């Protein structure tokens, strides 16, 4: 009814507040920021998803744009709080709209060590293994045979 009632509700922490949160954070992007920002990529926009705990879960690849290791880095987060600002963050400062470095045309989406090692292991072939010299009809049949 009033603002005090809403404050009492949100401090009571009931269950009818979580769906409202999911609704208001459905398409409201926030602004993630690294503590040192050498270039513009130190500040980006991201769609938030509710997680558990007290730490901020970040995409593994995008950290390469921040040069932020996972040894205890503290990142900041801000909200646009403005229709124009929300639209701008969704249009320009979004991570998908920033894939090439401002210095070089090379992508800042280069894969990191874990994924490249996995893919190299998947592609590196030996001379003799199970299923050597057979024939397959397609990639899905190959995945089935592997599983």
């Amino acid at each position: 009814t009033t603002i005090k009632a809403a404050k009492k509700m949100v401090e009571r922490e009931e269950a009818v507040v979580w769906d409202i949160l999911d609704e208001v954070i459905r398409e409201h992007p926030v602004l993630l920021n690294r503590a040192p920002t050498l270039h513009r990529l130190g500040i980006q926009a991201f769609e938030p998803v509710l997680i558990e705990g007290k730490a901020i879960q970040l995409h593994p690849l995008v950290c390469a744009a921040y040069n932020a290791d996972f040894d205890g880095d503290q990142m900041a987060v801000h909200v646009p709080l403005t229709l124009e600002a929300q639209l701008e963050a969704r249009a320009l400062m979004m991570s998908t709209n920033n894939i090439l470095s401002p210095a070089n045309g090379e992508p800042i989406i280069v894969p990191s060590q874990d994924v490249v090692l996995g893919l190299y292991y998947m592609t590196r072939d030996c001379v003799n293994a199970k299923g050597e010299g057979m024939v397959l009809t397609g990639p899905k049949e190959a995945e089935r045979l592997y599983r």
């Binding site: 979580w18 999911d22 998803v49 509710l50 997680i51 558990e52 024939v135 009809t137 089935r144």
Partner: protein, 321 residues
């Protein structure tokens, strides 16, 4: 509370009528992983269906050879046969012929209209045929099995004997062509994250992907029936058989949680059992020396917390001591 949850599907996409994507939400904290793994291992290996098993050609005995009339090699024809989605009735194994030549490419609809079986995709091309005097035909033989059958287990069959029928080609008895399970986070009104299952699958068109899921479910249920609680709730029958009094009466007095002096002066009066104390009043308690307010109040409050009263009338004593 020994009561888990049940999922409620919200997305069953049947795009292309043979590539399905189903969701299941919500599940427990770890049920999604095991469910996806079990369903995948069942659909891939333990899923009875039907597929091609044996090929018969005119005179091409070796795979390292080529027959004129086609613009491909025998390996291409074998790969095409490997994807021949056909279904059979209760018959265990049946042969079909393709004694047909001509000009245009040979497709699945060229097989004889055997009423006992039926091809899923008759328009599926078998082999692009040469447009001149392409005189070549063949024969197929399909069976029903458990799952994917490589050529290794058929090498032994080839080693057994060698008639004209002894050829080599794999068999995908599993009607499902591809399967992929994934887990994601689901939000309950209070529980924040639980396993939400997303199963993508694609079959050869022999059966509905949801029908294949239901078949896997019923085969798993048939496998587990040997251990399913022996019933729905394992005990739809309740009875009752208890004595008239409580076993506390048989218990010694030291189980009353009293002071050491009170316990000593109570045991000194040959009162070493609770039931020997419930059936008597405290007029004799004060007669024993060193029985003051402390011990009397402690005993009476203990028996009050236990509900029983000091001074009762029972004849069944002592059963059985």
């Amino acid at each position: 509370v020994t009561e888990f949850l049940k999922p409620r599907l919200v997305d069953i996409e049947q795009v292309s009528s043979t590539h399905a994507k189903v969701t299941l939400e919500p599940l427990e904290r770890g049920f999604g992983h095991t469910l996806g793994n079990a369903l995948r291992r069942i659909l891939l290996s333990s899923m009875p269906g039907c597929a091609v098993t044996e090929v018969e050609i005119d005179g091409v005995l070796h795979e390292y050879s080529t027959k004129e009339g086609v613009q491909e090699d025998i390996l291409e024809i074998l790969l095409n046969l490997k994807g021949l989605a056909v279904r059979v009735q209760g018959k265990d194994e049946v042969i079909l012929t393709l004694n047909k030549s001509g000009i245009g490419p040979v497709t699945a609809a060229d097989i004889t209209h055997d009423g006992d079986v039926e091809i899923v995709k008759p328009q599926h091309v078998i082999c692009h045929l040469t447009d001149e005097n392409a005189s070549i035909s063949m024969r197929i033989k399909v069976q029903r099995g458990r799952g994917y059958v490589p050529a290794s287990t058929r090498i032994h069959s080839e080693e057994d004997e060698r008639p004209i029928g002894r050829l080599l080609v794999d068999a995908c008895y599993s009607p499902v062509e591809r399967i992929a399970y994934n887990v994601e986070a689901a939000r309950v009104e209070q529980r924040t994250d639980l396993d939400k299952l997303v199963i993508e699958m694609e079959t050869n068109g022999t059966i509905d992907p949801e029908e294949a899921i239901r078949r896997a479910a019923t085969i798993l249920a048939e496998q587990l029936e040997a251990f399913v609680d022996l019933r729905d709730v394992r005990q739809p029958e309740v009875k009752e058989e208890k004595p008239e009094f409580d076993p506390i009466l048989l218990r010694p007095v030291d189980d009353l949680e009293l002071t050491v002096r009170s316990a000593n002066c109570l045991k000194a009066e040959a009162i070493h059992y609770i039931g020997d104390l419930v059936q008597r009043t405290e007029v004799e308690l004060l007669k024993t020396p060193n029985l003051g307010k402390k011990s009397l109040t402690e005993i009476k409050d203990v028996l009050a917390s236990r509900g029983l009263s000091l001074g009762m009338r029972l004849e069944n004593w002592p059963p059985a001591s």
